[PDB]
Write a protein that binds this DNA or RNA. Sequence first.
DNA 1: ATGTGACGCT
DNA 2: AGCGTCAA
Length: 424
Amino acid sequence: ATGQDRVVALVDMDCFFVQVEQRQNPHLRNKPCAVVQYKSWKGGGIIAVSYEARAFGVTRSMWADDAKKLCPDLLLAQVRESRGKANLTKYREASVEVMEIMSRFAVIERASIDEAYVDLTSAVQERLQKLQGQPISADLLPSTYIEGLPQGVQKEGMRKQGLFQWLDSLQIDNLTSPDLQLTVGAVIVEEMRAAIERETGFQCSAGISHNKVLAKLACGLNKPNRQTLVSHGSVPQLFSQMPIRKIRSLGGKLGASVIEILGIEYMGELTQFTESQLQSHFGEKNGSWLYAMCRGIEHDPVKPRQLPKTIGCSKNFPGKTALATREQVQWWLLQLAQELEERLTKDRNDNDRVATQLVVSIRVQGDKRLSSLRRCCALTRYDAHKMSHDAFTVIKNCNTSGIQTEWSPPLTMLFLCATKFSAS
DNA sequence: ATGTGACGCT
DNA sequence: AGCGTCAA
Ligand SMILES: Nc1ccn([C@H]2C[C@H](O)[C@@H](COP(=O)(O)NP(=O)(O)OP(=O)(O)O)O2)c(=O)n1
Ligand SMILES: [Mg+2]
Ligand SMILES: [Mg+2]
């Protein structure tokens, strides 16, 4: 069993927030530029970076003042602020544009604001019947790389050489061949990406493979504005020098313990271990997942879900801005509640659903965790004053200050999240 | 002083 | 229900 039953694609917009700002402001197009939030602390935090600016070393999570040292001509678009908070509505609305287009071709799993997985298995079957044994020509794959080819001068010439080798070895006599299915999947993803660019102006990259992990890895191989086919046969060479941390979900603690417990570096080294061995170190599910994954096999389905299942709104209060008075906490809980309410009302009108749970999270000064404490409470009315009052009720117990007006220990984050949606 | 969404574990 | 991880 080779895990070649499905055709899965991962479409990811290139430097998404930048492209959103570049569409709106033509003077930013074809320039080193980045998107920044809050200009007051070190010129603001960089949150997205055009490929021209990336060539100078500018990255996400950099302060704009430091980015300017690397790239003095860097152009910056600023995130909208509302009620004292960075507001991401323009990017969420642009996300909805691209997802609705992708949804025309197949069912999609929203994986982030700027990417979706798509199960193309059925669409490939139908497209194979319309083709009626007719070969696939290179003109149908004008931006596709075949990973690991060519084998046996300039960028575009080698892409074509690899594509030509792939298409000349293709056995179209068989409508069940997985390589043919992947190839037809890639013809559809070219049309998908052309529709996105035509109808939004936004460019994106894609990976095409047999499962989600390989599709996502494939997408990043030839960014920007290109797509990549990772076939089952290409996995052994691909994985033989692929660091473990590059595989989705292995970029943190679990991947680091794989490396340390097993004494290995690359994904292909995992194949020498039995399934039971991997389960002993990493548990039954992780072990089974690793045993199949290092062979290019994974079964996680593309879930039919185009909409987020939580709706969240948070604000950081770093260092000396931390909230230390009762009245401060109440004012910022109401600012957040008002943003959440307008987001929730729009969600109900657009998507015919209502959240029923409100989760209230806070961070306390001196805690290195994301959240210091989470408490849930009922969400009955999209009313910001009631939501903020309710949110305060369930956290006022955390004020350990003897004086009534002060708040201690001081709060470095407030986080409101509406969840548990039901039809409406 | 980086600044919200999906999921597994218990 | 409350927490931790990974990321996007
Ligand atoms: N930590 C992060 C990751 C992403 N984002 C936002 C900004 C991104 O433009 C957008 C999509 O994230 P992304 O796909 O990981 N990278 P981006 O689309 O900017 O560039 P590519 O590397 O995908 O071409 O989500 C963020 O604000 N904070
Ligand atoms: Mg992207
Ligand atoms: Mg992305």
